Design a protein around this ligand. Sequence first.
Ligand SMILES: *[C@@H]1O[C@H](CO)[C@@H](O[C@@H]2O[C@H](CO)[C@@H](O)[C@H](O)[C@H]2NC(C)=O)[C@H](O)[C@H]1NC(C)=O
Ligand SMILES: *[C@@H]1O[C@H](CO)[C@@H](O)[C@H](O)[C@H]1NC(C)=O
Ligand SMILES: *[C@@H]1O[C@H](CO)[C@@H](O)[C@H](O)[C@H]1NC(C)=O
Lengths: 396, 100
Amino acid sequence: HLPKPTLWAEPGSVITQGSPVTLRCQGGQETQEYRLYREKKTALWITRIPQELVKKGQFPIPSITWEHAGRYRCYYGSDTAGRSESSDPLELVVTGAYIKPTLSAQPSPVVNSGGNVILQCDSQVAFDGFSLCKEGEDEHPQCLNSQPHARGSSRAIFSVGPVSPSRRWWYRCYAYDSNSPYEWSLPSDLLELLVLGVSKKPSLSVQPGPIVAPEETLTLQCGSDAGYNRFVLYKDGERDFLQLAGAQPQAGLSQANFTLGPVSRSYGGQYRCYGAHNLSSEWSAPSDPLDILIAGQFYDRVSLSVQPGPTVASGENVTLLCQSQGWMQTFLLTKEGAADDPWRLRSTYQSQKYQAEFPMGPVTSAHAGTYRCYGSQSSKPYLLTHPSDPLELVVS
Amino acid sequence: HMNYETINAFIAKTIEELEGIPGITKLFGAKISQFVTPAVFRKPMSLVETILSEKKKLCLCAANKNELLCRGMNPNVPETLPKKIEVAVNEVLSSVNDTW
Ligand SMILES: *[C@@H]1O[C@H](CO)[C@@H](O[C@@H]2O[C@H](CO)[C@@H](O)[C@H](O)[C@H]2NC(C)=O)[C@H](O)[C@H]1NC(C)=O
Ligand SMILES: *[C@@H]1O[C@H](CO)[C@@H](O)[C@H](O)[C@H]1NC(C)=O
Ligand SMILES: *[C@@H]1O[C@H](CO)[C@@H](O)[C@H](O)[C@H]1NC(C)=O
């Protein structure tokens, strides 16, 4: 009837190959009696441990290999007494055996507070075992695994539970063969989720503008009056979010920017920005989306004209006409230095070409500058033709 | 000692141990049994080089290029397969050679 012992591992249960570990047993304040045993397959290493260390409930592994991996339990038995019942199991896992899997959140790593997310673990080669581990700084790994609903033998799915902004969520996943289930692959790269709050949304801008050509460089900018000191940028479809270096807030005024280039087709997409305060780990509601479009992606060239003319006095009816010989689903009109979104119109087939008329109505001095139009096809959505030659509007 | 129970127990336990090494069953299939014979009892660590040279050969076959032992292993760490065969054979040998 002796209190059962406790079995734990310094520094942890999930260790990389080669790294040290020490399995530790503790039962009451007494000693001089300890025993450790693997389940199913005896572990000989245990026999080779000094009797001075066993008495202290210490079973160290200088360099861990798959030969040490397995489930351990512990127990202590005196002379006159019989012995204590076996400790709760300790699953000693050895990582780095195989090529790392791929971890991703479906549909996005951006989760609303209280929401759930699917985390997908993917492997090149087939595996009948996958395990997902939660990581924390102050915390030790917390794994969970799946062989049932671990589909196609090359992918496993896990439904992360209620996400709270009460902690930083870090995840890695592992792949393994069930003929050695304590010998895991190399870990997948860390996955961090962005948990959301309802906090004032920031504003997302781009310099020089949203329509950008290949080999150019852009600067994505975030800002608030809400006094955020941290900013995050996230492009739809991406595995990860980008955490930009946040400035120090003035009159709540803060701005963070990211300068990327060369631009490629890959840059094209819908982007959102999020702010947070130094204390909070509950991000803001997203900025309105920003679509970055990639110029010069089609064989087709476009033309931009005006009806009346390039020079016209205030109040007159002015209409800009964008047109192409090749089929285009939509036409896009932009002005040099225009914080507003480009004007997108469905195409029309007139005079043996495809066009779109952008009516301005009566002219002001705001209604004057440098216009360029673009061709688009929905098949390639964040793509554009080269710009039309610039058209200059000069008002009297 | 080299008698019927032990020769037989060595052969099955070795095959079982080899089929227990992750990757072997998928790559080697039913042919694995053919590598363990009373002859192997006489030279057991010979299994290490005979299975390795067959695996190397099997990994060239177009159909096996997405198999674990062929491209699933972490390249930047020394190959487990030779040690796993060496441990398997020695463990079986102990279990079998300790008749009493
Ligand atoms: C300037 O004049 C009028 C407004 O006074 C406009 O003309 C109309 O434009 C629409 C465009 O969808 C057409 O469907 C109408 O048929 C036009 N009106 C008439 C009575 O035909 C327009 O804003 C300007 N006109 C042009 C030609 O650009
Ligand atoms: C990017 O932000 C910094 C201040 O954080 C500053 O240089 C400027 O506002 C931005 N850069 C450009 C090129 O506008
Ligand atoms: C958050 O806190 C630090 C102090 O630890 C302070 O210097 C600054 O306001 C913030 N730093 C960062 C990196 O956000």
